[PDB]
Every structure is written in structure tokens, then in C-alpha cells.
Design a protein around this ligand. Sequence first.
Ligand code: HEM
Ligand SMILES: COc1ccc(C(=O)O)cc1
Ligand SMILES: [Cl-]
Length: 393
Amino acid sequence: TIPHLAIDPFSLDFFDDPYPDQQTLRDAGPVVYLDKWNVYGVARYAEVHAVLNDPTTFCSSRGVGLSDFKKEKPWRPPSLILEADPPAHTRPRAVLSKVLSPATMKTIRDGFAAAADAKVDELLQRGCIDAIADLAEAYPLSVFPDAMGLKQEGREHLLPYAGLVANAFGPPNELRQTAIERSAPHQAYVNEQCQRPNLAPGGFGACIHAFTDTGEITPDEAPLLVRSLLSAGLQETVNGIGAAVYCLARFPGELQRLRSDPTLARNAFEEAVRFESPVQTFFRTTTREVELGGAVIGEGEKVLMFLGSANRDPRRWSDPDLYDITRKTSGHVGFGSGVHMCVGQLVARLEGEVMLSALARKVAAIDIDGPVKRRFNNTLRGLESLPVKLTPA
Ligand code: HEM
Ligand SMILES: COc1ccc(C(=O)O)cc1
Ligand SMILES: [Cl-]
């Protein structure tokens, strides 16, 4: 009854151009079985949204990667928020939500915007830049580690550790094996920065350790919660900003609309998150026999959600392949959906908005003038290099 497919969604072939295979996964049926990895898959918006919003059936405490924590050991101690289910997830989630609160965004917005404006001004003096290393990577690295309270030394481990975590969600392929082989130095840095004395006062990390006396988390849980903010978000935001610059370069009429109304910057980044979906996939594990899209999925089965495919499902989106900065983007699953919906989404949207705002006010044209290179990762989609020429307004 359930179509069986041989598509490997974690192959370099798939990463190079996933969109034809994603339609095949969508059009095969609401639920498919991936014989390569022995998991169920949902690629349409409806089923992806349904699975995300049923955490009691499709749990996260057995791992949101391929590995079932009931069968194998996790490569690192489980996340207290990402790899936890309610009610154990609830109170650590509330702490991270208040650490990255709307009030916190108000405290840091003016500084995040000034750094975004300064970066664009600097890049316009060079003209020909790499929109990834010099822009998409350079700007979040200039605001987020400081907002975190991290020391200056050792920040070169942040992006490698981010890519290691994302690769470790994947199947035991070469990308995952090689990432774990290289992991020890990045792992040693991150865990040490999670200790209270190593986090600057007023920053995100210090605020987590200060939240350890309310009955929501204990002092021994704060290091792992700081680890969550060092394991997630940085590369996704970089890939989201890099995809926005790439889209504005290939859809030049959308850059012209953004220039004419810079207040579209926030939705221009939100559309880039849907268009690119920096987090392509996440797993769930069934705690029960469940019926999903006419399929009967047994207990203890892994279910692979195609977030990027759900954001390009023509059953849900009109012209899903087009970058449209005025599209009604509400409802996209680029940040997930439900109780686990990205707790750091306000940080990412703040960084993305103020960067696109600086581009909208200061840049007249963005022209690709070099070979574009894609970075391969078991979980993340993003560009490695994006040579562009910036023309000042
Ligand atoms: C474009 C930027 C981002 C994207 C596309 C993204 C993607 C996602 C997605 C899809 C989830 C859902 C996980 C699940 O359902 O299992 C998630 C959760 C999470 N994200 Fe993000 N994220 C972004 C930015 C950030 C930032 C800036 C931070 C931290 C400062 C962050 C930290 C987290 C954490 C801690 C979780 C776990 C929340 C939970 O399990 O309740 N992310 N992210
Ligand atoms: C990439 O998405 C995430 C989200 C949370 C965590 C974590 O809590 O460690 C890691 C990766
Ligand atoms: Cl780790």
C-alpha cells in the first residue's frame, strides 16, 4: 500500500539538486518508505505539519536523527530541549524562550542593525566580495558570539561544531563518519564555553545560568542549555542570509522591489528561509501505532520530515519555486512547527532583517561574477561560496 522508493535523501547527488526528487517523494503518496535507510517519509506540507504538531505520537526523545536512542547511544549527551519531550521539554524551553525573549531582542536590535550597516559599507569599499565568507558568514559571526557572551579565542570552532551536529543527525554515511572523526577539538571548546565563568555578563549564556533558581532548570542543566545555543542557529542563519543574497542576485526585480520599500526586509528574509529551508529535514520516532495519510505506521519507527519539500509543496504554495518577497510566508515550516518550533527564530529573523535592510538602503545591484559552490551536509542546505559584485546605491 505504501510506495517504496530507493531515493537516498542524504546522497551528494540529492544535495546537488534535491527538488526533482522532492516532487517524486511528494507525488508518490502522502507517506512513503525509504528502503535505503528503513524509515518512513513525509514530503507534503499537510503530513509534515501534522507530524510536527503531534509530539506525543511522533516524539523527539528517541532522537531527531536517524539513530534511535532506544537502540543506539547518542554521539553526545542528549539535548535537554531538542531531544526531549513534554513535560521534561517544557520548562527548559521556557527558560530559553525568556533568554531569547522579545525584550532581549529590543536590547540588542540597535547594535545588530549598526553592525549590519557597517558590514555593508565595508563590503561596498571592496566591490567584489564573497557573499558567503565576507557577508553571510562574517555578519552573524560579528554579532552572535558577542551577544552570547563568548570570549574571543576559539570562535573558529563555532561553525565546524555547528556542521558536526547537523551531520550527526544523518545516516551513518561518509559525511557523518568524517564529521565525528574531526569532532574532538570542536567538542572540547564548546563544552568548556558552556561553564558559567566563561560567559560574559548580560549575554545569552550568563542569562541562562542566572535562570537556574526558579524551579524551571537546575544549575547542572545550564551547561547543556548553553550548548543548545552553540549547537544550533549560526549556520542556518548564515545559509538563510546567503540564500537571500543569491535570490536577490538571480531575481533582480525582487531586489528592485526591496530597494523601493526597505520595510519588506523582514519578509524578504522569511521568504528566503522558506525558499532555501536551511534545515532540510528532521526525524521523529513513533511511540505508538498510528494512522498517517492512509498508512499504518507501527511503534518505534523513524519518520523523516522533508521541511524543504513541504515549503515547496504546490498543494500549499502558489508558484513555490519563485522567490517572492511579498508572499504571505506565515505557515512555512522552515523553523518547524508546534512545541519545538525554533526557540531562536527571533534572533535569526533579527539578523536576517537588518542585513537585508542594509542591502536595501545601500546597494543598487548584486551581480554574480564567479563560480557558485554548494556546501554538502546531511541536514543543512547552504552555499559554500557566492562571488558577487556589489554596486553602491
Ligand atoms: C534561519 C535560521 C534557523 C532555522 C532555519 C532553524 C531551524 C530550526 C528548526 C526547523 C527547528 C525545529 C526542530 C524540531 O522540530 O525538531 C529548530 C529548533 C531549534 N533551534 Fe533553530 N533555526 C534557526 C535559527 C536558530 C537560532 C538563531 C537559534 C539560537 C540562537 C536556534 C536554536 C534552536 C533550538 C535550541 C532549537 C530547539 C527548540 C526545541 O526543540 O524546542 N535556531 N530550529
Ligand atoms: C539544528 O537544529 C538544532 C536545534 C537544537 C539543537 C540542540 O538543542 O542542541 C541542535 C540542533
Ligand atoms: Cl558535544
